[PDB]
């Protein structure tokens, strides 16, 4: 047979496509899962992680810190209008409140 | 001479259950809103969809007014103000006021 | 089990010199798990509403369009349409 | 076309809401909040319809959109 090439390598993504495929197959969402469905899911998860990690890196660069701490994640997630809507119902552990003083 | 007649109107409107907004301008507004996101093509509406949308909008508006009036009487005055309803939308949450 | 590799991989891809603490790794892990669950549940009720038993690529696209806000989703949609067109290209 | 929700209509809505006095500056923002509520709900219902191969928004898709947003509505679901 041919060489064992993972579908994540042939899709140009870093997230595993077989893992999310197995998770959807065992997730009891539907008895049949499509072929391109885990690929789309891996792509959007990869994009979301890239967006939040880029924001975290921008939030940690100014503090002269080369390590992402959970405080940086909160500061990055509460400075983006869309990410705040996506993460409005959630709260991040070990994350302080944004510094705002009323007049 | 009919003085302080608003209380009778309050009781009559709270006892009734019919829709308060007319259907034709509301349907025109709904079509004007829907034409923006459909990239141009014209869509058709069902007879019950517009009625359900009007019922939901009326419920939303009556919630906003009934929780903002208590904010106004919390400040000490009886006149409803737009800053008060804006503050009510801000404090109600992302999914409750918006 | 929990995946902490891919997060480190995409972090090194987006930034060559930034690390990440162990707690932030668990935060990102729980975050992607919750997002995956939300999108999958949305797609599942979508397929159930239309008497469909298979979750094709259209269901997940419409599900992510419903869940994710407006400006991001477009981008995300693009990413989706940039992924499958290569996956079926081979 | 947003002038449909006229001044006595919003007045009657506030009267049903228990409000007594109404300032004259409310009619410039209640139309806006109605507009944003409709722009959210109708967009959710219309992508609900567009997932399937249909072109008419039905009452089922509106209540589906309302349930996904968080304010479920009974009576028309069926």
């Amino acid at each position: 047979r041919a060489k064992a090439k993972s579908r994540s390598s042939r899709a140009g993504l870093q997230f595993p496509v077989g893992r999310v495929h197995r998770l959807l197959r065992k997730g009891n969402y539907a008895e049949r899962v499509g072929a391109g469905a885990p690929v789309y899911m891996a792509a959007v998860l990869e994009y979301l992680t890239a967006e939040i990690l880029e924001l975290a890196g921008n939030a940690a660069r100014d503090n002269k810190k080369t390590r992402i701490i959970p405080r940086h994640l909160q500061l990055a997630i509460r400075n983006d209008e869309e990410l705040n809507k996506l993460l409005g119902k959630v709260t991040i552990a070990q994350g302080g409140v944004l510094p705002n003083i009323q007049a | 001479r009919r003085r302080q007649g608003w209380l009778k109107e309050i009781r009559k409107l709270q006892k009734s259950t019919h829709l308060l907004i007319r259907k034709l301008p509301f349907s025109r507004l709904a079509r004007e809103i829907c034409v923006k996101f459909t990239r141009g093509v014209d869509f058709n509406w069902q007879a019950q969809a517009l009625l359900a949308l009007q019922e939901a909008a009326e419920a939303f508006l009556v919630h906003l007014f009934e929780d903002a009036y208590l904010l106004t009487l919390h400040a000490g005055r009886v006149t409803l103000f737009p800053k008060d309803v804006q503050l009510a939308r801000r404090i109600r949450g992302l999914e409750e006021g918006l | 089990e929990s995946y902490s590799v891919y997060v480190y991989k995409v972090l090194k891809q987006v930034h060559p010199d930034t690390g990440i603490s162990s707690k932030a790794m668990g935060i990102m892990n729980s975050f992607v798990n919750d997002i995956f669950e939300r999108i999958a549940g949305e797609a599942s009720r979508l397929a159930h509403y239309n008497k469909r038993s298979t979750i094709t690529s259209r269901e997940i696209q419409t599900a992510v369009r419903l869940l994710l806000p407006g400006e991001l989703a477009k981008h995300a949609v693009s990413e989706g349409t940039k992924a499958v067109t290569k996956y079926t290209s081979s | 076309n947003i002038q449909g929700i006229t001044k006595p209509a919003i007045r009657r809505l506030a009267r049903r809401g228990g409000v007594k006095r109404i300032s004259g500056l409310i009619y410039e923002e209640t139309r806006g909040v109605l507009k944003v509520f409709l722009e959210n709900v109708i967009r959710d219902a219309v992508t609900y319809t567009e997932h399937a191969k249909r072109k008419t928004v039905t009452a089922m898709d509106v209540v589906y959109a309302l349930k996904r947003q968080g304010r479920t509505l009974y009576g028309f679901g069926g």
Partner: peptide, 18 residues
């Protein structure tokens, strides 16, 4: 790149007129 534009509108929620 064309990464999503970020603005800082007066409104906390970006619902009306971005």
């Amino acid at each position: 790149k064309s990464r999503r534009i970020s603005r800082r509108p007066s409104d906390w929620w970006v619902v009306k007129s971005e």
